[PDB]
Design a protein around this nucleic acid. Structure first.
Lengths: 94, 64, 348, 130, 394, 353, 64, 130, 97
RNA sequence: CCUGCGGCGGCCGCAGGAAGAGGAACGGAGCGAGUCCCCGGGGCGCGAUUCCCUGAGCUGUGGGACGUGCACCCAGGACUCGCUCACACAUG
């Protein structure tokens, strides 16, 4: 269970056994691989498996936990992560 | 192997998934022929490539 | 059955149709196999043909003869012969030697007609020279063959270029010209070489040392025959009227001269009986003449096989059969078909 | 269609079979397919010709690149095998009893269909050099 | 008339007449690094050529192969390591390298460098590359515009991960849709990208971004840096056949169509033509100083990668330019460039450093004890030498 | 009318001279040389060669002996032996042209011959395949001479072709392009072994000797005798000037290097070809390559070996462009004009002063 | 001897064994006439080669 | 038939005999050969023109190369001997009873065909000269 | 006499005028001496090497047979063997560096 | 301090260097000799019995015999040790 959580990204259309999400993290900070994704109430949805797109605006797919289903999530529904599993652009950029 | 091509008026490859050109004729396969290092038919390939004037030496010389 | 020329020889089947394939074709002699099984014929088309002895003889009308083999050469055939010790009972003995223009001396198998061996004669420059004559030794071990100023002796067991060379002309002395015929004495250890240069030469078999050198003939000598006595022998030439009789005793000069019409540059053959009593010869006119050798040879008979040159005559070694080959070179003008024939010469 | 297939042709595809010889060859192949006498593709034909088999090698004139099968014509000439190019790759595969195109097949003789095989063989042996 | 021409040839006198007009060269058709040799800025013409090397195109066959490369069309079974190992075995040569690892089932441009051309492999491996692949979508799409919009979105500097490690950044410069087939759900795409860009990963990201899912069906590399698939491209059969023809017919013709000299890879770079005496010094790891510059190209800038060449057109080394074109034209002395990678072998050209006037002066002063054993000043040095001689070690 | 002629129609080594790279256009012309086609008949023959059609009886050393009786000269050479019964192209160099014989003897030959096979083959295609087999670098035993067994050696056959076959006589015409010193008699023996039937070379004719062929400029021995007779009895050069050609015709394939008239005599004395004397130079001169050095009137001065490439010549201002291989021209054809130049004058001045 | 030839439409020798070319004309022998150095008929050959315009000096001059 | 042989003629083969004159010359040669009064080779004909033996010299107009016999026309003009060309060398050899060709024959005069000889001689000397 | 060992020289192709033509298949493409004795794997002498011909890396040789041998005896692809000292390396005939 | 090569993307080890970049006659030619390389008795003419011969023997656009005479069997290249000519940067 996380101590505190910070926005991870909003819901985009689903994929085969995954949910693709557009990242809207503060200062564009990139999430770590295999990091747990949470709802607004700190209830874990899944785990981040792949991250893709341009350096400024990028997307992330979430490997769902066994209870959840990809079709259930609403349009532009927001998702969260613990702040200790985020990284700045300055590691990747130069 | 699905990747085909036909040559443009400029001389470069126009890639396509179809097996015929817009002008009717067959598209060639994009990939080169299979090779194995045990091949001992160099004499054979050269011998007929000479006959039909399609050996690499007999073509017009490149621009350097 | 025994030879008898008290009557004119009775006709027996011959072949004419196959020789008429080429225009102006003609036969270049005929030769019985030494066992008497078949007859070999040369022709201007450069195709040696073997005809079997007619089955209808032992079995009346006879059908036109068909050859059991045709063995093609690629150039003019200068000479050809059966193996000396041939028997039809042995496939190893039944074969035909043959020499041709700018080619090796080919050995042809007389049953299947395949090229069995090749003897090759090279000059000092390592260029192939063709033999103008051929003769096997009376043992069948060696193959003697004549060239310009030289005889070579190939060993029949080892076919190839290997050969003992025997020069007949050394520092402008000896028998000159192309050696056109070789023949061995049945009794004596010698052989006689005729040349297109007028002379005859006698030579010892083992060494090749000259025993004698004989003149006589007024043209290039074309054929030789030894009598079964061993002492007496006969010779004939091209564009020359006389057939000269010789003897190994009282040598140096021919004993008798027998007339025959020879008006072309051809090898007009002649042959003796197996017994040795009669001598038969062809002619450019066509008339086949016969002489009884047993004094001067007495004329017995003259008959005409066809209205054309009779170049070949061959007598069968056991039966009384005369074979005759016909034809000659036709000469043009600015703007009868040739044939082999058999003849029964037995008594009444 | 035969004359249209000459537009698709390969630089080394000679001697090309005529419109009638092409028809005769397909039917000899189909008969050989029923008796299972043919050999299909480069890998099999190359193996069997090297092994010692004899027959007629029918090549496809639409084949590209030429390096897939341009060694085969000389493999025939080393062993005196007759060979011939037919116009299409897709027609050869259909005649050979396959769902896809094929660049080369070798037809072997058989007592079932020697009359058709002999008509093709002698006509293919008679073909003039380019 | 042919006969009238023949009659004039024997009747009237011919002479290459004297003229006063300026002698103008045309070097536009000269091969490789000698192309437009006339257009280079000339510092000096006074030197002594050595007659040791050769024009790159006319090296002897052994030296030609050792200093050469093949623009290979890679076949579809073997790995890239296995392909260069075949070429190493065929050409009977010691070392071989390539311009970027293509996966076993991928075909296309693979610049196989041979022996001494393997010094360029790092430069060829870092060069920009173009691909033509087929993405296989798992489910159906409304139209080809959607797959093009996905490629439009992934044009730029992207996040990527290798196939089955850390996250990596890879730029895709340009992307395009050639065509799409809705029956079999296959779409041909063309992409220009930097080196090390994972195209399998791109196909997966196109699948995720569309929503349908997808993967790479097949791939082909059409460009590798300077070389393309319409530029002298050759197959493994040609390489084998060309070697065979040289072995059995003693005919170099086919090898010289297959293999090209490494100087053909360097034709894009700006040139600095060195004096023949300075060549072997640079091969041993010397500084590219001003006394040895004969010619220098227009538009050389500071920190620019330049090719340093001989008067015969051979490449000596890749180098980093320290002076601009305008500075080389006006300065009296200094370091013009520093070595990045020495291409040419040691003792190709002879060993001719320390023979000049100013170098021999320094040697003499070290012998006289006016300078120290390591060429450094003393209290006794003349003020003329001490002021003028700008020692570059500093 | 020379002004109307395009430079492509200028004779011999001056052909296409405007497409040579121009170093400098200025020099002082001297009234010394002539164009090689207008040499005085004596000099024309002493620097000339004959593209002879050899007859079929004599040896090739007999034929060139006969030519040196007829023309009344002391030296001749002959571009590779043809065997006594062989005919065809025999380049006969006369006098000063004998300096070129190694380049002519080493040149690629072509032959048209007849092979006679000793038994039948299937057809003309079978002979055509055995010829393809004997293309490339072949083993051939050189024939024994003076009982000296020369070792097995390698000679290349560039192309082969089966022209005709006669199944009746078993004769086959072949055309062969090959390296110098190839034995065609030996080729026919091997061609026979390879077929299995056996064989011999019936006949042979050489249809090319490097630069010259039987297509053009070829003359028979009768022409050589006949042309000399016409000159001896009527004082007419016209026939001899079509039998004999100047040695420059043998050198038209080589890369050229045009020199100033001042330099010409220096080079004939054994001076190395220096860069300040070069007027023009061809594209594609490489290091250690044999080049022809010529005058502005198109006369060959020497065969030289290049120590500068084309590009190097363009960049430099002085030094050795080429060293001599063989000097063709006589000494003192041109006058001595060396030592007069600016730097050479400065050297001699500053030695005296 | 055996080699004959006829000229094609661009003046090249076409060698052949056959005595007649494909247009029915006789083929020439490939080999030149036999030469003697003691030949004394030089006057005679020039005399009629001039007469019929076939002496070498009367032909079109070669382009060099 | 005569006009076909007219294609094969030399540059120097004039004066060429008329079709009927060609036939007269062959019939005269046949009679001279029968009488043993001709010379056949260049080797021979040249030898007896040097000795100064008179006769009608008949030449083959299709002889190539011309160098073999082209000295003979002038040898005749030096001695005022009558000479003439005829269409072919094979027919000239055939006229002398030979299968092989020949490029020249010189017919000597004789009593048995003196009238035929004089008839040929008369027409040969009457020919227009180039 | 009989050598201590023999190395693979070549294999039988067609006979030609009473001597046998053989494709040479030596290791390292080595070339036999002229008149070098040719043996069968039993170390019995069948003949001597007469001609050597063909391309450098695909060459043939004819064998002049012994007194007792006949060219009809040999079968297709039958191997022949040579005394290894009577070979030479291919490098000798290739050009000087 | 630089370069190159190899080992596991920076370091390690080994190896070559420490480099200011010279020289407008260097050190050539042409002959001759010795030694290597190269390096398939024949060719030409005349004479007399038309000198013989349309040979199935190449062959009359040439083959042979006997007299006789005649001219061929080099020229190059490389190495080595002489003689001769120069020691030449090419005249704005």
């Amino acid at each position: 269970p996380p101590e505190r959580v910070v926005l991870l990204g909003e819901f985009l259309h689903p994929c085969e056994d995954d949910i693709v999400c557009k990242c809207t993290t503060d200062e564009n900070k990139v999430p770590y691989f295999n990091a747990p994704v949470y709802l607004e109430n700190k209830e874990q949805i899944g785990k981040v498996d792949e991250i893709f797109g341009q350096l400024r605006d990028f997307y992330f797919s979430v490997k769902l936990s066994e209870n959840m289903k990809a079709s259930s999530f609403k349009k532009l529904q927001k998702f969260y992560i613990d702040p200790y599993k985020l990284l700045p652009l300055q590691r990747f950029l130069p | 192997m699905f990747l085909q091509y036909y040559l443009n008026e400029q001389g470069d490859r126009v890639y396509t998934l179809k097996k015929f050109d817009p002008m009717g004729q067959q598209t060639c396969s994009a990939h080169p022929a299979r090779f194995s290092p045990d091949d001992k038919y160099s004499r054979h390939r050269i011998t007929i490539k000479k006959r039909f004037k399609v050996l690499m030496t007999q073509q017009p010389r490149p621009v350097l | 059955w025994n030879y008898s020329f008290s009557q004119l020889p009775r006709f027996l089947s011959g072949s004419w149709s196959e020789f008429s394939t080429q225009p102006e074709n003609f036969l270049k002699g005929c030769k019985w196999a030494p066992d008497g099984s078949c007859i070999l014929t040369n022709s201007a088309d450069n195709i040696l043909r073997i005809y079997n002895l007619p089955p209808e003889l032992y079995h009346v009308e006879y059908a036109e003869m068909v050859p059991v083999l045709r063995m093609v050469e690629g150039d003019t055939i200068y000479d050809y012969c059966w193996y000396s010790l041939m028997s039809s009972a042995q496939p190893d003995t039944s074969y035909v030697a043959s020499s041709s223009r700018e080619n090796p001396i080919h050995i042809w198998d007389a049953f299947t007609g395949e090229l069995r061996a090749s003897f090759r004669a090279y000059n000092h420059l390592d260029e192939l020279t063709a033999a103008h004559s051929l003769c096997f030794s009376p043992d069948g071990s060696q193959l003697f063959c004549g060239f310009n100023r030289t005889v070579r002796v190939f060993s029949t067991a080892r076919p190839g270029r290997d050969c003992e060379v025997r020069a007949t002309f050394a520092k402008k002395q000896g028998q000159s010209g192309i050696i056109s015929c070789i023949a061995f004495s049945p009794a004596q250890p010698l052989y006689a070489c005729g040349s297109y240069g007028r002379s005859l030469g006698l030579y010892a078999w083992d060494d090749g040392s000259p025993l004698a050198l004989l003149g006589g003939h007024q043209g290039g000598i074309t054929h030789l025959c030894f009598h079964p006595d061993g002492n007496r022998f006969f010779s004939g030439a091209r564009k020359d009227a006389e057939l000269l009789c010789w003897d190994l005793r009282q040598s140096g000069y021919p004993l008798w001269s027998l007339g025959r019409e020879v008006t072309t540059n051809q090898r007009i053959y002649f042959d003796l009986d197996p017994t040795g009593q009669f001598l038969v010869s062809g002619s450019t006119s066509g008339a086949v003449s016969v002489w009884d050798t047993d004094g001067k040879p007495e004329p017995v008979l003259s008959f005409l096989p066809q209205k054309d040159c009779t170049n070949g005559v061959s007598l069968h070694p056991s039966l009384p059969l005369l074979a005759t080959a016909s034809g000659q070179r036709v000469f043009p003008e600015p703007t009868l078909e040739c044939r082999l024939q058999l003849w029964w010469c037995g008594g009444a | 269609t035969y004359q249209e297939l000459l537009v698709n042709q390969n630089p080394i595809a000679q001697p090309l079979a005529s419109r009638r010889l092409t028809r005769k060859l397909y039917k000899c192949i189909k008969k050989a397919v029923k008796q299972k006498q043919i050999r299909r593709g480069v890998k099999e034909v190359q193996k069997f010709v090297n092994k010692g088999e004899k027959g007629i090698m029918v090549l496809a004139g639409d084949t590209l690149p030429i390096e897939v099968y341009c060694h085969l014509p000389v493999m025939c000439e080393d062993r005196n095998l007759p060979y011939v190019y037919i116009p299409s790759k897709t027609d050869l595969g259909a005649a050979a009893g396959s769902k896809r195109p094929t660049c080369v097949i070798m037809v072997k003789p058989h007592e079932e269909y020697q009359e058709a095989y002999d008509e093709c063989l002698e006509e293919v042996q008679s073909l003039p050099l380019p | 008339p042919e006969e009238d021409v023949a009659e004039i040839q024997h009747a009237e006198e011919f002479l290459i007449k004297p003229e006063s007009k300026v002698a103008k060269l045309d070097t536009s058709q000269w091969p490789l690094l000698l192309k437009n040799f006339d257009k280079l800025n000339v510092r000096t013409t006074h030197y002594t050529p050595l007659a040791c090397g050769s024009n790159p195109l006319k090296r002897e066959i052994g030296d030609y192969i050792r200093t050469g490369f093949i623009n290979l069309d890679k076949p579809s079974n073997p790995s890239s390591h296995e392909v260069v190992a075949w070429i190493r075995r065929i050409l009977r040569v010691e070392k071989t390298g390539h311009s970027g690892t293509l996966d076993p089932k991928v075909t296309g441009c693979l610049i196989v460098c041979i022996e001494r051309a393997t010094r360029l492999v790092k430069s060829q491996q870092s060069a920009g590359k173009e691909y033509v692949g087929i993405v296989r979508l798992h489910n159906a799409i409304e139209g080809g515009t959607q797959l093009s919009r996905a490629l439009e979105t992934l044009t730029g500097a992207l996040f990527q991960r290798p196939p089955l490690r850390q996250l990596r950044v890879r730029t895709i410069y340009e992307s395009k849709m050639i065509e799409y087939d809705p029956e079999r759900r296959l779409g041909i795409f063309w992409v220009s990208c930097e080196a090390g860009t994972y195209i399998r990963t791109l196909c997966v990201h196109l699948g995720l971004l569309l929503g349908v899912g997808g993967q790479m069906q097949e791939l082909r590399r059409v460009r590798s840096g300077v070389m393309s698939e319409k530029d002298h491209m050759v197959t493994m059969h040609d390489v084998l056949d060309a070697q065979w023809l040289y072995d059995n017919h003693k005919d170099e013709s086919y090898l010289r169509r297959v293999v090209y000299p490494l100087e053909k890879l360097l034709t894009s770079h700006k040139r600095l033509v060195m004096k023949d005496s300075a060549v072997n010094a640079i091969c041993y790891g010397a500084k590219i100083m001003l006394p040895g510059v004969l010619r220098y190209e227009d538009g050389i800038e500071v920190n620019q990668e330049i090719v340093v060449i001989t008067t015969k057109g051979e490449a000596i080394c890749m180098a980093i330019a320290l002076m601009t074109t305008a500075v080389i034209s006006t300065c009296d002395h200094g370091i013009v460039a520093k070595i990045k990678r020495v291409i040419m072998e040691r003792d190709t050209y002879p060993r001719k450093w320390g023979l000049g006037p100013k170098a021999s002066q320094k040697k003499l002063m070290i012998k006289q004890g006016l300078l120290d054993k390591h060429g450094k000043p003393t209290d006794s040095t003349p003020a003329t030498w001490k002021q003028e001689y700008v020692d570059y070690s500093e």
